[PDB]
Design a protein around this ligand. Structure first.
Ligand SMILES: Nc1ncnc2c1ncn2[C@@H]1O[C@H](COP(=O)(O)OP(=O)(O)OP(=O)(O)O)[C@@H](O)[C@H]1O
Ligand SMILES: Nc1ncnc2c1ncn2[C@@H]1O[C@H](COP(=O)(O)OP(=O)(O)OP(=O)(O)O)[C@@H](O)[C@H]1O
Ligand SMILES: [Ca+2]
Ligand SMILES: [Zn+2]
Ligand SMILES: [Zn+2]
Lengths: 222, 81, 296
């Protein structure tokens, strides 16, 4: 499916930005884990079910603390605060804890993970804009000389016939094969010239910004 | 079958600009090998081509002409079997 | 020649300094508390840990980082010549001010405490431009985000007043006491705001989730339903959702501005500014026009 591929391209094109944002998220989690270990180590209690006490500390060492904050903090909607034990309102450290969760909520869940999402949207808009421009160019200008559709207006020869026969690219390709295949001694005037030009590697014999259909008015002016 | 088919279908015209800038129209026969080009390759070339710095895609089209000729040659040999 | 040699390799010292900064952070992260160039450095650090130990290896890595950065700073000032711009200029220079602060952080980390090395990871933002652009997506419209938060705070304030005046009883919170479980939390207006703000915005449902479950047959049931629903539709779907909308809007604006700037740079020449389309069907092409004819 091409549509599914395009959807995947929406995250693949800016994959580097997403990875870097994840690194920033990891760095912020690292800083918060350090702060918790220094100040709020006691409050780090996790409930676990033992296969055949329920709650025990999880921030005894820095490595375990970062895993607990990263694994159980980012996934939870509230953030780190949800996993930690409920703080008593009358407790002296209540305000510090309240600020701690709010900062995590406003620094790691609303302005970090949301940025990763925003990168995806920006890629979606970029992909659509690029596709729209490419289709417009393909359907509005002809391949060989590149003239716009509006030029072929109020003229005997229309744009559709200009591209179909007058500036048919496959006709040019056929001529290239004929010139390459035909012998030197059998070359005519025009065929000898293009063969010489092809050897010179100069791509100027191709018409540009000009065609006989529009020159018909020029011929009348002549 | 139709007498005016082999001499008609195998005919094409193009536009070129010479050294003196005087544009000319060349009517030439279509060689037999050119008739073997695959439609799928034709569609890929039309869509995959990209514009250069000047905005003219002719340079990319010309660069792949040799590949198309070789692909057509293989198609002829493939058609033999 | 000596100062020139130091300045010429600016990428080398900066790449190493960041390279060491990363390895020190991982080592402390993985082990704390304790009792191709890149793979080669990994082997050396691993070997030092195996023989010298975590302690001495960290001390060595800090010493190398400090020496690398100080010579990086002296090279930076010499190459940029900030002194020629003026002694006042270098002091006010943002780049110079950032470097001295990093130098201060490095020496504090080496001596004051090991964890100070953690904040050195902020340098990654400066190292990567794409990450900087991502951060710029929120920094450009920071004022709008702050004001939206202020509007959010006002809305939580209004709801807290309404809850205190009418729904004070339902404000019950569960707490775990260190060595009754549930108790009131809206006895005073201030604590009510903290409970609603802290436990309301974070919760997906909103304020209603934290409050006690209302009885369906209770007379005040319809009031609670309307109250909870209003918070959900006025503080979580139209307030926090707006903040992200600003971030998305900034992303589009930054991309559009960058695209226009690149198009202008690559489509018109610096001096006269003529468009590329003008240089068509002429003996002299646009590329040679800018290369020689109009080379700034
Ligand atoms: N210079 C050009 N500008 C725009 N479209 C072009 C140009 N050259 C070819 N095309 C398009 O590319 C396709 C190639 O045309 P082609 O003559 O092979 O069509 P066809 O109808 O399959 O052939 P046939 O002549 O055998 O009926 C067609 O869509 C044609 O419109
Ligand atoms: N007027 C202009 N408009 C647009 N681009 C320009 C203009 N003048 C110079 N440039 C571009 O700015 C850069 C400066 O060109 P410069 O002559 O220094 O190139 P260089 O190849 O490094 O030099 P050298 O001539 O020694 O090979 C090049 O990218 C050149 O294309
Ligand atoms: Ca002859
Ligand atoms: Zn044309
Ligand atoms: Zn110019």
């Amino acid at each position: 499916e091409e549509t599914l591929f395009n959807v995947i391209k929406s995250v693949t094109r800016n994959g580097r930005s997403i990875l870097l944002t994840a690194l920033l998220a990891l760095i912020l989690v690292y800083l918060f884990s350090i702060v918790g270990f220094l100040f709020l180590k006691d409050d780090f209690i996790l409930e676990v079910d033992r296969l055949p006490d329920s709650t025990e500390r999880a921030c005894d060492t820095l490595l375990m603390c970062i895993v607990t904050v990263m694994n159980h903090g980012l996934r939870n909607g509230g953030g780190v605060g949800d996993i930690l034990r409920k703080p008593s309102k009358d407790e002296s450290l209540f305000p510090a804890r309240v600020v701690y969760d709010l900062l995590f909520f406003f620094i790691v869940i609303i302005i970090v993970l949301n940025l990763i999402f925003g990168v995806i949207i920006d890629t979606f808009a970029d992909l659509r804009s690029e596709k729209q421009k490419k289709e417009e160019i393909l359907k509005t200008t002809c391949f060989i000389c590149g003239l716009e559709r509006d030029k072929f207006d109020n003229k005997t020869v229309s744009f559709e016939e200009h591209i179909k026969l007058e500036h048919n690219m496959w006709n040019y390709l056929y001529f290239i094969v004929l010139v390459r295949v035909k012998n030197k001694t059998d070359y005519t005037g025009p065929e000898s010239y293009v063969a010489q030009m092809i050897k010179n590697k100069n791509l100027d014999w191709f018409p540009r910004m000009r065609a006989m259909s529009l020159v018909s008015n020029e011929g009348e002016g002549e | 079958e139709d007498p005016l088919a082999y001499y008609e279908n195998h005919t094409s015209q193009i536009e070129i600009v010479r050294q003196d800038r005087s544009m000319e129209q060349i009517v030439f026969p279509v060689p037999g090998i050119c008739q073997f080009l695959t439609e799928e390759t034709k569609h890929r070339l039309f869509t995959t081509t990209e514009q250069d710095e000047q905005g003219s895609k002719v340079s990319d089209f010309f660069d792949q002409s040799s590949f198309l000729h070789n692909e057509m040659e293989w198609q002829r040999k493939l058609r033999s079997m | 020649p000596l100062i020139y040699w130091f300045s010429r390799r600016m990428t080398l010292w900066g790449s190493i300094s960041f390279n060491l900064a990363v390895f020190i952070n991982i080592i402390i992260a993985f082990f704390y508390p304790y009792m191709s160039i890149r793979p080669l450095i990994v082997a050396l650090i691993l070997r030092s840990i195996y023989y010298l130990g975590i302690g001495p290896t960290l001390n060595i890595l800090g010493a190398l980082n400090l020496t690398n950065k100080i010579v990086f700073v002296v090279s930076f000032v010499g190459n940029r010549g900030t002194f020629i711009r003026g002694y006042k200029a270098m002091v006010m220079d943002m780049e110079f001010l950032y470097h001295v602060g990093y130098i201060l952080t490095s020496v504090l980390g080496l001596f004051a405490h090991e964890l100070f090395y953690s904040i050195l990871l902020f340098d990654l933002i400066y190292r990567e431009e794409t990450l900087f652009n991502v951060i710029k997506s929120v920094t450009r419209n920071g004022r709008s985000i702050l004001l939206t938060a202020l509007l959010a705070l006002i809305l939580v304030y209004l709801f807290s007043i309404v809850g205190f005046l009418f729904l004070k009883d339902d404000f019950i919170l569960e707490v775990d006491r260190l060595p009754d479980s549930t108790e009131r939390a809206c006895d005073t207006l201030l604590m009510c705001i903290v409970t609603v703000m802290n436990h309301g915005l974070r919760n997906g449902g909103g304020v209603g989730d934290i409050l006690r479950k209302p009885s369906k047959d209770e007379s005040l049931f319809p009031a609670r339903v309307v109250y909870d629903l209003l918070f959900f539709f006025i503080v979580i779907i139209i307030v926090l959702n707006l903040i992200f909308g600003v971030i998305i809007d900034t992303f589009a604006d930054l991309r559009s501005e960058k695209q226009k700037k690149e198009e202008i740079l690559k489509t018109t020449c610096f001096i006269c500014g003529l468009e590329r389309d003008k240089f068509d069907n002429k003996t002299v092409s646009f590329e040679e026009h800018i290369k020689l004819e109009h080379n700034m």
